[PDB]
Amino acid sequence: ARNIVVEEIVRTPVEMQQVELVERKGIGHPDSIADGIAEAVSRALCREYIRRYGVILHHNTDQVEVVGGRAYPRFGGGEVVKPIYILLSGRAVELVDQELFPVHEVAIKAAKNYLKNAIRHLDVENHVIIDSRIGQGSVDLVSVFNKARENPIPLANDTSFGVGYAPLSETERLVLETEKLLNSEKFKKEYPAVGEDIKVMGLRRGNEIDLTIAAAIVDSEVATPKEYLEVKDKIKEAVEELAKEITSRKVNIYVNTADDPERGIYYITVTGTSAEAGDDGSVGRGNRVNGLITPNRHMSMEAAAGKNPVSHVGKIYNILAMLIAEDIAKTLPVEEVYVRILSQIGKPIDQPLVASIQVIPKPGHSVKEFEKDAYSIADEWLANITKVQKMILEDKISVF
Amino acid sequence: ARNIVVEEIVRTPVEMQQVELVERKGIGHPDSIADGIAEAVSRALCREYIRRYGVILHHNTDQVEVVGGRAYPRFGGGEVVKPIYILLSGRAVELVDQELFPVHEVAIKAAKNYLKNAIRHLDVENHVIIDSRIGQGSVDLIPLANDTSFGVGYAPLSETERLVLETEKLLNSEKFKKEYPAVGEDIKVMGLRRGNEIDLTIAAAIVDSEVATPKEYLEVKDKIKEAVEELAKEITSRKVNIYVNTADDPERGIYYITVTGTSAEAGDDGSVGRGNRVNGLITPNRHMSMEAAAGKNPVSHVGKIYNILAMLIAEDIAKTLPVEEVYVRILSQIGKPIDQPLVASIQVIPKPGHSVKEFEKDAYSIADEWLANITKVQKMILEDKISVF
Ligand SMILES: [Cl-]
Ligand SMILES: [Cl-]
Ligand SMILES: [Cl-]
Ligand SMILES: [Mn+2]
Ligand SMILES: [Mn+2]
């Protein structure tokens, strides 16, 4: 019934390709800040719609602009001189049966709460201005409930595709886990000088990987250039240990490569994010839903962060494509699998115009031998598509 | 000696894959409006820096937020009820040796001029609010790489890529607009190929002042369909199915009519880097860069230059040599001039019956000459001769 297509492709697996480039924008990167606020706003709206009406009402808050401020970092502690300005945009239902729903209150509080929990040394009350221009919508709940009855699985409202793949390469895992380690609670507690604005790039040529880390250091935690350099060495040491667990390839680690001590240049910040110094961010400019930027792979340009987890395929299909890919890679004799899913307007989101599965089989196997099981994995996930709504709101799946 | 590497790759060509997906967001789509404004602002800043100082000063205007308005379309002509709001962001040099450069004036003027020329039925003075929060820079009056920057491009386009690209270009061309003024600029095209059959879905905003009745609206949709059917026959002999404004439901009174020709009027939002790559397409069957070219300084941003150069190198190779596919990737080497990349990888599938040895030397030479003329590409960008979305 469902438009699922399984095909074999021939390609050099990424692990065997000569040049592989992978990047991850960490939590404090301005683009990832935009994504994180967008998603925090969406989840807060979902939960408050549920609390008041028992159902999620339509909204999309996948539009956030982070306008950088100005700052004077100094060893021992600088100051922010001009605040970061953040504009929340999108659309949400505001009039519910002639009654007013507190869209802007929920959104601004969610954005502020996200920043406080994400960027430890950022003074949100004084370093940030948050304004909201979220568009106004209206609905009658009887209609909402009737729409839910007519179509238990929501209808697609856009023509969009999501893209995912599996399994991850060593270089992909290295980049992902380097950022996760350095922004982990345990590491932050041990090394409070390491801010959250961390960008990780892995470039593999053959069996040698250059792993470059741009990590904003918090100037209130380093009194001297010497203490700053000791922090960079502690970053390098921790990532060296991590790399030995992920790959037996040679890994060269570089931290804050624009540093130039003789010219007095160090990557120190007041708050731990370069957004303080004038760098800007917006939604969908960084990691895909698997958490990575991967030009050796395939992606959708849809920004998952902030999109309605109930009906917007731009989020749902990018998550589902990754989950189907991971399932196939985990259970079948596959070297690589790429999943692309395209919505059809007016049809339920479990009836995509196509769900395309492209597989490189392991040597000694053919896709024909397992094509029906691959179909079945995609079919069961599409038939259970609404559970993605549940995993988002239970904070079980990240979208950047 | 530039580190250019030409190698053969063995992989299923896109045209032989069973399923291919291609999308293009047309000029009036909110995301493409953001991209277009971003690039229009950058080029206006470049020209005015040159006019005043003889050099381009540092800037990045790759941050634009299009916040949709409200509108009540009506057959015969509706009205915009709440204006579109556009925030310009990024950074530009504003203090030039203690004197003030009119960043915000240049930027707002450039944004308004772009909209005026791009969206025919948009009343910019009354339908749009443009504000600027571009960050303030300062300065006192072949570049080296400061980072590892990346560009990726490919050629030639597949039949489905060509159909999607040329469908939007046709419907938003002046010649077509003159004959069918009811067709707005907010056109989104999705192409799905399965085997030798292509499904083409077109969402095209129709201008409500140009259609007096539902009957005229349906006639306009049929003229879109007929025109694209003709175009498809020029590109492919695969079966092509064309669908226009598929969410329409006449019995329930739903038609894709707009006052201005862009869904930004009705509350849809856009921002930079959410849509087309520099070749004009969104192509999940290919390899794409995540960087937003629009608004980036074309003189100093290596990622923008390399993504354009990679496309130009690929297109040249595909046009002149016996290649079925070519993928071009360029990586800068930190601390070296940008015309001396860390690697320029040229990956080719030869046409059947051919081997790369026949033409590997010519492919190297094509890549070499483009890298040697990186300054020529920068000029082409400012002369509006190369599109970036
Ligand atoms: Cl290959
Ligand atoms: Cl098929
Ligand atoms: Cl990229
Ligand atoms: Mn960015
Ligand atoms: Mn969009």
UniProtKB/Swiss-Prot annotation, chain B:
Q: What function does this protein fulfil?
A: Catalyzes the formation of S-adenosylmethionine from methionine and ATP.
Recorded catalytic activity of this chain's protein: L-methionine + ATP + H2O = S-adenosyl-L-methionine + phosphate + diphosphate
Look up the record and give one Gene Ontology term from the biological process aspect: S-adenosylmethionine biosynthetic process
Which Pfam families does this UniProt record tie to the protein? AdoMet_Synthase
Gene Ontology MF, one: ATP binding
What is the protein's given name?
S-adenosylmethionine synthase
Q: Report the cofactors.
A: Mg(2+)
User: Which positions are annotated as binding ATP?
Assistant: G135, Q136, G137, S138, V139, D140
Q: Which HAMAP family does the protein's record reference?
A: S_AdoMet_synth2
Named in its record, the pathway it takes part in is:
Amino-acid biosynthesis; S-adenosyl-L-methionine biosynthesis; S-adenosyl-L-methionine from L-methionine: step 1/1
Enzyme class name? transferase
EC number, as in UniProt: 2.5.1.6
Q: Which UniProt keywords apply?
A: ATP-binding, Magnesium, Nucleotide-binding, One-carbon metabolism, Transferase
Q: Does the keyword Transferase apply?
A: yes
